[PDB]
Design a protein around this ligand. Structure first.
Ligand SMILES: C[C@]12CCc3c(ccc4cc(O)ccc34)[C@@H]1CCC2=O
Ligand SMILES: C[C@]12CCc3c(ccc4cc(O)ccc34)[C@@H]1CCC2=O
Lengths: 128, 125
C-alpha cells in the first residue's frame, strides 16, 4: 500500500486533475473495480466505465475549479482524507462548495474507494 | 438522525469541548457503545469507559488547544467530516497537528463512530 507520504502526493494530484478537468487522467487513478460515493449517502458508482461517465458529467460541462483548502491527512494503511473547495457556475450563479474526500488506495497505488462528504449546507454563492 | 445542519452543529460543539478539555461532556456526546479509531488505522476502542480513558490521557494535561480550520461537511444520513488543528507539546516544544474527523451519529443524536485521520506527516514544529 502507498505510504502516508505517497497518499498525500496521490490525493493532491487528484485535486490537480479535477481542477484542470483531465477526465481520462482522473479515471486512470482509479482501480478498475473502484467505488465512488459522491455525495456520501447516495448509491455507489462501480467501476472504471461508470466512474468515467460520472466525472465527464461533473467536469465536462461548465468551467469547474478545485483546490485544497488544507493539508491532506494521511494514515498508515493506504488511506487519507482531504479538505477542498470546488467552484462552479450554477445557472448563472457563481458558487463554491466545500468538500472532504476520504480515499483508500490499493497495493497498486490506485484509488479503491472514494467518499465525498458534502451537502447543500456546504454550498454558497461566491465569486471565483 | 441529525440533519446535515444538526451534524454541523454537533461536530463544531465537539471541537469546542475538546478545546476546553471538558472530558465529561465529550464522553456524553458518544453513544454508550460507540467506537473510536484514532488515528484511523489503529484498533478501535469500544464504549464510553474506554473512550473516557482515551480522552483523559489525550487531554488530561490541559495544554491542548483545538479549533476548526474549515467548515464541517455534512451528509443527509447523519454523517460528517471536519478539518481541524490541535496544538500541544512535542519534545518539549510547541507543535501543531492537522486532523480530519469523520463521525456518524445515531438516531438519538449521539456519536456512534469517530475516525480521526492523521499521522506524522501532519505534525509540525
Ligand atoms: C459535480 C460538481 C463539480 C465537481 C464536484 C462536486 C462535488 C464533489 C466533488 C468531489 C470530487 O472529488 C471531485 C469533484 C466534485 C460538484 C457537485 C455540484 C457540481 O457542479
Ligand atoms: C492527543 C493529541 C491532542 C488531541 C488530539 C490528537 C489527535 C487526534 C485528535 C482527534 C480529536 O477528535 C480530538 C483531539 C485529538 C493528538 C495526538 C497527539 C496529541 O497531543
Amino acid at each position: 500500500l502507498p505510504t502516508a507520504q505517497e497518499v498525500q502526493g496521490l490525493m493532491a494530484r487528484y485535486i490537480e486533475l479535477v481542477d484542470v478537468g483531465d477526465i481520462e487522467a482522473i479515471v486512470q487513478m482509479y482501480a478498475d473495480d473502484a467505488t465512488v460515493e459522491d455525495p456520501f449517502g447516495q448509491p455507489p458508482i462501480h467501476g472504471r466505465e461508470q466512474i468515467a461517465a460520472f466525472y465527464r458529467q461533473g467536469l465536462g460541462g461548465g468551467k469547474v475549479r478545485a483546490c485544497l483548502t488544507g493539508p491532506v491527512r494521511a494514515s498508515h494503511n493506504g488511506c487519507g482524507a482531504m479538505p477542498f473547495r470546488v467552484e462552479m457556475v450554477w445557472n448563472g450563479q457563481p458558487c463554491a462548495l466545500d468538500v472532504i474526500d476520504v480515499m483508500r488506495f490499493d497495493e497498486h497505488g490506485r484509488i479503491q474507494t472514494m467518499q465525498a462528504y458534502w451537502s447543500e449546507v456546504n454550498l454558497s454563492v461566491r465569486e471565483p
